[PDB]
Short mmCIF file of C-alpha atoms (C1' of nucleotides) in Angstrom, two decimals:
data_model
loop_
_atom_site.label_atom_id
_atom_site.label_comp_id
_atom_site.label_asym_id
_atom_site.label_seq_id
_atom_site.Cartn_x
_atom_site.Cartn_y
_atom_site.Cartn_z
CA UNK B 133 -1.41 56.79 16.04
CA UNK B 134 -4.02 54.21 14.98
CA UNK B 135 -4.06 52.70 18.44
CA UNK B 136 -5.26 56.03 19.94
CA UNK B 137 -8.32 56.29 17.74
CA UNK B 138 -9.03 52.53 18.11
CA UNK B 139 -8.92 52.76 21.76
CA UNK B 140 -11.17 55.95 21.79
CA UNK B 141 -13.84 54.11 19.89
CA UNK B 142 -13.36 51.00 22.04
CA UNK B 143 -14.28 53.46 25.01
CA UNK B 144 -17.27 54.77 23.28
CA UNK B 145 -18.61 51.25 22.39
CA UNK B 146 -17.81 50.10 25.87
CA UNK B 147 -20.21 52.67 27.19
CA UNK B 148 -22.53 52.40 24.15
CA UNK B 149 -25.78 50.53 24.25
CA UNK B 150 -27.37 51.04 20.78
CA UNK B 151 -27.98 48.45 18.13
CA UNK B 152 -25.27 47.97 15.63
CA UNK B 153 -26.83 46.22 12.76
CA UNK B 154 -29.15 47.93 10.34
CA UNK B 155 -32.84 47.48 11.32
CA UNK B 156 -34.37 47.26 7.81
CA UNK B 157 -31.83 44.60 6.55
CA UNK B 158 -32.13 42.67 9.78
CA UNK B 159 -35.88 42.70 9.40
CA UNK B 160 -35.68 41.71 5.86
CA UNK B 161 -33.32 38.89 6.82
CA UNK B 162 -35.58 37.36 9.46
CA UNK B 163 -38.63 37.98 7.04
CA UNK B 164 -37.14 36.02 4.21
CA UNK B 165 -35.60 33.27 6.42
CA UNK B 166 -39.14 32.62 8.03
CA UNK B 167 -40.72 32.79 4.49
CA UNK B 168 -38.03 30.10 3.48
CA UNK B 169 -39.42 27.81 6.34
CA UNK B 170 -43.03 28.34 5.20
CA UNK B 171 -45.42 26.24 2.81
CA UNK B 172 -46.74 27.89 -0.28
CA UNK B 173 -50.39 28.27 1.08
CA UNK B 174 -49.71 31.13 3.49
CA UNK B 175 -47.28 33.75 4.51
CA UNK B 176 -46.30 34.50 8.23
CA UNK B 177 -46.62 37.85 9.89
CA UNK B 178 -44.24 39.56 12.31
CA UNK B 179 -44.18 42.34 14.70
CA UNK B 180 -41.56 45.09 15.48
CA UNK B 181 -41.14 44.39 19.17
CA UNK B 182 -40.49 40.70 18.22
CA UNK B 183 -37.97 42.00 15.80
CA UNK B 184 -36.13 43.93 18.59
CA UNK B 185 -36.30 40.90 20.93
CA UNK B 186 -34.85 38.52 18.37
CA UNK B 187 -32.06 41.03 17.56
CA UNK B 188 -31.34 41.67 21.17
CA UNK B 189 -30.89 38.00 21.82
CA UNK B 190 -28.89 37.55 18.62
CA UNK B 191 -26.27 40.13 19.56
CA UNK B 192 -26.20 38.89 23.09
CA UNK B 193 -25.07 35.46 21.77
CA UNK B 194 -22.78 37.18 19.21
CA UNK B 195 -21.05 39.33 21.93
CA UNK B 196 -20.54 36.28 24.02
CA UNK B 197 -19.04 34.15 21.21
CA UNK B 198 -16.82 37.13 20.16
CA UNK B 199 -15.46 37.76 23.51
CA UNK B 200 -14.66 34.02 23.97
CA UNK B 201 -12.88 34.15 20.61
CA UNK B 202 -10.90 37.08 21.96
CA UNK B 203 -9.97 35.09 25.00
CA UNK B 204 -8.84 32.14 22.75
CA UNK B 205 -6.84 34.68 20.78
CA UNK B 206 -5.09 35.80 23.94
CA UNK B 207 -4.35 32.10 24.73
CA UNK B 208 -2.89 31.72 21.19
CA UNK B 209 -0.44 34.60 21.72
CA UNK B 210 -2.12 36.36 18.76
CA UNK B 211 -4.08 39.62 19.02
CA UNK B 212 -5.90 38.43 15.72
CA UNK B 213 -9.09 36.43 16.03
CA UNK B 214 -8.84 33.81 13.15
CA UNK B 215 -10.61 30.90 11.60
CA UNK B 216 -9.26 28.08 13.84
CA UNK B 217 -10.01 30.27 16.95
CA UNK B 218 -13.63 31.02 16.01
CA UNK B 219 -14.03 27.09 15.10
CA UNK B 220 -12.65 26.20 18.49
CA UNK B 221 -15.02 28.59 20.34
CA UNK B 222 -18.00 27.27 18.54
CA UNK B 223 -17.01 23.69 19.26
CA UNK B 224 -16.18 24.15 22.82
CA UNK B 225 -19.44 25.97 23.74
CA UNK B 226 -21.19 23.40 21.56
CA UNK B 227 -24.70 24.93 21.40
CA UNK B 228 -27.25 23.29 19.07
CA UNK B 229 -24.43 21.21 17.50
"C1'" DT A 1 -21.02 147.80 31.05
"C1'" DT A 2 -24.10 143.94 28.47
"C1'" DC A 3 -24.75 140.17 26.28
"C1'" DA A 4 -23.28 135.47 24.99
"C1'" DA A 5 -21.24 131.01 25.98
"C1'" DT A 6 -20.48 127.60 29.25
"C1'" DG A 7 -21.12 124.81 33.42
"C1'" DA A 8 -24.06 122.66 37.10
"C1'" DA A 9 -28.29 120.90 38.68
"C1'" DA A 10 -32.88 119.41 38.21
"C1'" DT A 11 -36.22 117.18 35.11
"C1'" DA A 12 -38.34 114.59 31.47
"C1'" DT A 13 -37.78 110.71 28.83
"C1'" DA A 14 -36.07 106.25 26.46
"C1'" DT A 15 -34.65 101.86 27.46
"C1'" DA A 16 -33.65 97.48 29.32
"C1'" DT A 17 -34.43 94.45 33.04
"C1'" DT A 18 -37.18 92.08 36.42
"C1'" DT A 19 -41.39 90.41 38.09
"C1'" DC A 20 -46.29 89.61 38.06
"C1'" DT A 21 -49.87 87.48 35.60
"C1'" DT A 22 -52.24 84.35 32.79
"C1'" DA A 23 -53.10 80.60 29.43
"C1'" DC A 24 -52.31 75.69 28.69
"C1'" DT A 25 -51.36 71.38 29.97
"C1'" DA A 26 -50.03 67.29 32.75
"C1'" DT A 27 -50.45 65.29 37.25
"C1'" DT A 28 -52.95 64.09 41.45
"C1'" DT A 29 -56.89 63.07 43.97
"C1'" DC A 30 -62.28 62.32 44.75
"C1'" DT A 31 -66.13 59.37 43.30
"C1'" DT A 32 -68.80 55.29 41.66
"C1'" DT A 33 -69.29 50.77 40.15
"C1'" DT A 34 -66.92 45.44 39.52
"C1'" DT A 35 -64.01 42.32 39.89
"C1'" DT A 36 -61.42 39.45 42.89
"C1'" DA A 37 -59.82 38.25 47.13
"C1'" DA A 38 -61.69 36.88 51.78
"C1'" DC A 39 -64.47 34.38 55.63
"C1'" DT A 40 -67.31 30.03 56.92
"C1'" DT A 41 -68.40 25.11 57.23
"C1'" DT A 42 -67.82 20.34 55.30
"C1'" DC A 43 -65.63 15.92 54.65
"C1'" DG A 44 -62.32 12.85 53.11
"C1'" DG A 45 -57.87 11.71 52.39
"C1'" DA A 46 -53.26 12.65 53.26
"C1'" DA A 47 -49.93 12.81 56.88
"C1'" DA A 48 -47.99 12.44 61.71
"C1'" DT A 49 -47.17 8.40 65.70
"C1'" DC A 50 -46.10 3.27 67.37
"C1'" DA A 51 -44.65 -1.50 67.08
"C1'" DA A 52 -42.15 -4.83 64.82
"C1'" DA A 53 -38.07 -7.18 62.05
"C1'" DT A 54 -34.76 -7.49 58.50
"C1'" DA A 55 -31.29 -5.81 55.15
"C1'" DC A 56 -27.05 -3.15 55.47
"C1'" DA A 57 -22.46 -0.72 55.80
"C1'" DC A 58 -18.68 -0.06 59.55
"C1'" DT A 59 -15.23 -1.80 62.02
"C1'" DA A 60 -11.66 -5.93 63.53
"C1'" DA A 61 -7.83 -9.12 61.67
"C1'" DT A 62 -4.80 -10.76 57.96
"C1'" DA A 63 -2.03 -12.28 54.25
"C1'" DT A 64 -0.75 -12.03 49.12
"C1'" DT A 65 -0.11 -8.86 45.93
"C1'" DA A 66 -0.60 -5.62 42.93
"C1'" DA A 67 0.38 -0.93 43.14
"C1'" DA A 68 2.92 3.09 44.60
"C1'" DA A 69 7.25 5.84 45.95
"C1'" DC A 70 12.69 7.27 45.33
"C1'" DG A 71 16.70 7.86 42.67
"C1'" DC A 72 19.97 8.63 38.41
"C1'" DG A 73 20.23 9.45 33.74
"C1'" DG A 74 19.22 10.91 29.10
"C1'" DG A 75 17.34 12.46 25.16
"C1'" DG A 76 13.08 15.37 23.83
"C1'" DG A 77 10.84 19.60 24.06
"C1'" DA A 78 9.84 24.15 25.69
"C1'" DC A 79 11.79 28.58 25.38
"C1'" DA A 80 14.35 32.54 23.51
"C1'" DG A 81 16.56 35.61 20.09
"C1'" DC A 82 17.12 37.31 15.10
"C1'" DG A 83 15.42 37.96 10.50
"C1'" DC A 84 12.25 38.42 6.14
"C1'" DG A 85 8.03 39.59 4.93
"C1'" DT A 86 3.11 40.39 4.24
"C1'" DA A 87 -1.62 41.09 5.19
"C1'" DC A 88 -4.43 44.17 7.81
"C1'" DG A 89 -4.73 48.87 9.08
"C1'" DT A 90 -5.16 53.56 7.21
"C1'" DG A 91 -6.08 57.79 4.02
"C1'" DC A 92 -8.99 59.77 1.05
"C1'" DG A 93 -13.17 59.86 -2.65
"C1'" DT A 94 -17.15 58.67 -4.37
"C1'" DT A 95 -21.78 56.69 -4.00
"C1'" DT A 96 -25.22 53.62 -2.18
"C1'" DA A 97 -28.71 52.14 0.63
"C1'" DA A 98 -30.22 52.98 5.50
"C1'" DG A 99 -33.47 56.04 8.39
"C1'" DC A 100 -37.39 58.68 8.84
"C1'" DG A 101 -42.01 60.49 7.56
"C1'" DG A 102 -46.45 59.90 5.00
"C1'" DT A 103 -49.29 57.93 2.40
"C1'" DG A 104 -53.32 53.14 1.54
"C1'" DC A 105 -55.14 48.76 2.45
"C1'" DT A 106 -56.05 44.12 3.28
"C1'" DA A 107 -54.70 39.90 5.87
"C1'" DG A 108 -55.32 39.04 10.25
"C1'" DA A 109 -55.67 39.44 15.81
"C1'" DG A 110 -59.27 39.53 19.60
"C1'" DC A 111 -64.00 39.23 22.00
"C1'" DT A 112 -68.73 36.94 22.09
"C1'" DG A 113 -72.61 33.73 21.21
"C1'" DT A 114 -73.66 28.73 20.13
"C1'" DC A 115 -73.80 24.16 19.18
"C1'" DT A 116 -71.49 19.83 18.97
"C1'" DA A 117 -68.68 16.56 20.78
"C1'" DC A 118 -65.09 14.31 23.27
"C1'" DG A 119 -64.31 12.74 27.98
"C1'" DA A 120 -64.54 11.41 33.17
"C1'" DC A 121 -67.32 8.62 36.00
"C1'" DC A 122 -70.23 5.11 37.06
"C1'" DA A 123 -72.69 1.12 36.41
"C1'" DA A 124 -73.28 -3.94 34.92
"C1'" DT A 125 -72.38 -7.42 32.13
"C1'" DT A 126 -69.19 -10.88 30.41
"C1'" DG A 127 -65.18 -13.75 29.94
"C1'" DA A 128 -61.89 -16.69 31.89
"C1'" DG A 129 -59.84 -19.46 35.28
"C1'" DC A 130 -60.04 -22.74 39.16
"C1'" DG A 131 -61.43 -25.99 41.60
"C1'" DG A 132 -65.40 -29.03 43.71
"C1'" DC A 133 -69.17 -31.75 43.52
"C1'" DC A 134 -72.24 -34.80 40.95
"C1'" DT A 135 -73.07 -38.77 38.16
"C1'" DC A 136 -72.52 -42.94 35.53
"C1'" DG A 137 -70.10 -47.12 34.53
"C1'" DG A 138 -67.32 -50.72 36.30
"C1'" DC A 139 -64.99 -56.03 39.37
"C1'" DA A 140 -65.95 -58.80 43.79
"C1'" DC A 141 -68.93 -60.92 46.33
"C1'" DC A 142 -73.17 -63.60 47.99
"C1'" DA A 143 -77.86 -64.84 46.91
"C1'" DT A 144 -81.36 -67.36 43.99
"C1'" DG A 145 -84.50 -69.74 41.02
"C1'" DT A 146 -84.76 -73.49 37.58
"C1'" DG A 147 -83.28 -77.64 35.00
"C1'" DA A 148 -81.03 -82.22 35.25
"C1'" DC A 149 -80.52 -86.46 38.05
"C1'" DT A 150 -81.39 -89.89 41.65
"C1'" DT A 151 -84.05 -92.27 45.37
"C1'" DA A 152 -88.21 -94.51 47.35
"C1'" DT A 153 -92.92 -94.47 47.97
#
DNA sequence: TTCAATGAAATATATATTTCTTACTATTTCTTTTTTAACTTTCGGAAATCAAATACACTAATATTAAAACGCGGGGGACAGCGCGTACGTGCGTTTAAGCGGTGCTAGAGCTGTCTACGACCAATTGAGCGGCCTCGGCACCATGTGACTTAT
């Protein structure tokens, strides 16, 4: 049954504590974003521990948002998180908006 | 009978296992020198009393009056069951880019010496505003000297 494997990997990710997004692509993403903010005279410089810090905060925020979306999904009688549910979570928590 | 084959016991040896020993390294502790906290007066300014004296928010009493509570009904909406369907999950199969380890190198972080330069603090001048006093010019009044006129010597 798909539910058995799904719940098994839910268990392993409930007691998992590793990063889930690829390090080199994430570093490139923040790299190119902060070059986008920059003037043409220079280029910024970054450090690995800063990269881990930003990624850690990013996924803290993401896990909070996703669990709130799951709670909205339970409210809406649907086990599927959908576009309107995610919109509602973003609005209600209303950070930097 | 005499000799040969076999069995039993002691012994020598091979082997595997355990323990001692030793090398290497990481951890803990002793030692010396350096920063950073610690102890001592000092003085000024903040903070703890003491006496007013004036806003200030209940607590009383009371009518109009808007607001709130009870009751019956009805039509709207929440809820539930059945049914068609699809969109997300899965099952494999490749293949793609992530992860890790070396390679260089150059832009850039970090500590130090130095000079310049803002800036806090203090001193003194200046401007501005408000009266207050001084000073000069002006009507009301009496005082005054001279000309005109008259009289008698």
